[PDB]
């Protein structure tokens, strides 16, 4: 119930690591395989996962 159960020891990383970013050039690809479109800066249609 102490330490190992909910928390862990790891080798430290400077930034959050490799978090999945959702880059797109959506106007050209209507929707690649499974995506719905709404064009402004709230929910851009994704074209895959990239590395920041």
């Amino acid at each position: 119930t102490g330490i190992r159960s909910w928390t862990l020891l790891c080798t430290p990383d400077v930034t959050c690591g490799s978090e999945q970013v959702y880059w797109s050039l959506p106007d050209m690809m209507q929707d690649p395989v499974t995506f719905r479109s709404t064009r402004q800066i709230s929910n851009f249609p994704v074209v895959g996962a990239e590395l920041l």
Partner: protein, 50 residues
């Protein structure tokens, strides 16, 4: 007879955005318009509201 309706569909409605920007230099909108099936919408009689 044929250029007139007898169905329960409206004429004037009010649309609202969900999760919209509220910043000092940019104030954005998200009017997710989904016009009813077998029903047209004239845009020259359509405007916003402050």
């Amino acid at each position: 007879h044929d250029v007139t309706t007898d169905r329960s569909q409206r004429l004037t409605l009010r649309f609202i955005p969900v999760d919209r920007e509220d910043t000092a230099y940019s104030y954005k909108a998200r009017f997710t318009l989904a016009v009813g099936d077998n029903r047209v919408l004239d845009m020259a009689s359509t405007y916003f509201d402050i």
